């Protein structure tokens, strides 16, 4: 049962991002159901899925800290950071594009958790 990998995709995967600017964040955040209440910080990995799953193997990952894996490759990435004083919509986001390796947790060879700390 990998509903958790599906949920990872929903929360942290966007194949081919449009603009990656503020309005991209404000939109994909709403579209992926992360706006009730406003998620304070959330990061989307772009590119193909093969690469993300491969972090679970030695192919594209190393063990990291206690329970996690850190990728060998660098991914294109957009971090959406909630702006303003309310946890409730409308949620205004600032976008930060980046390019670097990511940290996930894996169950049964699939990413089920993104560690958001490296993007804060």
Resolution (A): 2.5
Active-site residue identified among 7, 46, 83, 113: 113
Q: Is 80 annotated as a binding residue?
A: yes
* Catalytic residue status for 113: yes
* 42: CATH: 3.10.130.10
Which among 7, 12, 46, 64 is annotated as catalytic? 12
Which of 81-99 are b and which e, b meaning 16 or more Cβ less than 10 Å from the residue's Cβ? bbeeeeeeeebebebbeee
Q: Is 64 among the catalytic positions?
A: no
From residue 43, how far is each of 11, 14, 17, 40 by CA, in Å?
Answer: 8, 10, 12, 10
56 assigned ligand-binding residue: no
What kind of experiment solved this structure? X-ray
Pairing of strands 92-100, 61-64: unpaired
Residue 28 exposure: Cα atoms within 13 Å on the Cβ side: 29
Nearest alpha carbon to residue 25 among 88, 96, 112, 87 = 96
Q: Distance between CA 40 and CA 93 in Å, rounded?
A: 9
- Structural domains in the chain (count): 1
45-55 CB burial, b ≥16 within 10 A, e <16: bbbeeebbbbb
Burial of 101 (0-12, 13-18, 19+ CB in 10 A): middle
Instruction: Tell whether residue 1 is among the known ligand binding residues.
Output: no
Note down the domain range covering 80. Answer: 1-120
């Amino acid at each position: 049962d990998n509903s958790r990998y599906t949920h990872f995709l929903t929360q942290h995967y966007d194949a081919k991002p449009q603009g990656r600017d503020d309005r991209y964040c404000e939109s994909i955040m709403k579209r992926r159901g992360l706006t009730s209440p406003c998620k304070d910080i959330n990061t989307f990995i772009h590119g193909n899925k093969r690469s993300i799953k491969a972090i679970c193997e030695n192919k594209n990952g190393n063990p990291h800290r206690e329970n996690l894996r850190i990728s060998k490759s660098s991914f294109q990435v957009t971090t959406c950071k909630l702006h303003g004083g309310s946890p409730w919509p409308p949620c205004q986001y600032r976008a930060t594009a980046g390019f670097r390796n990511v940290v996930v947790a894996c169950e049964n060879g699939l990413p089920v958790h993104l560690d958001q700390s490296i993007f804060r």
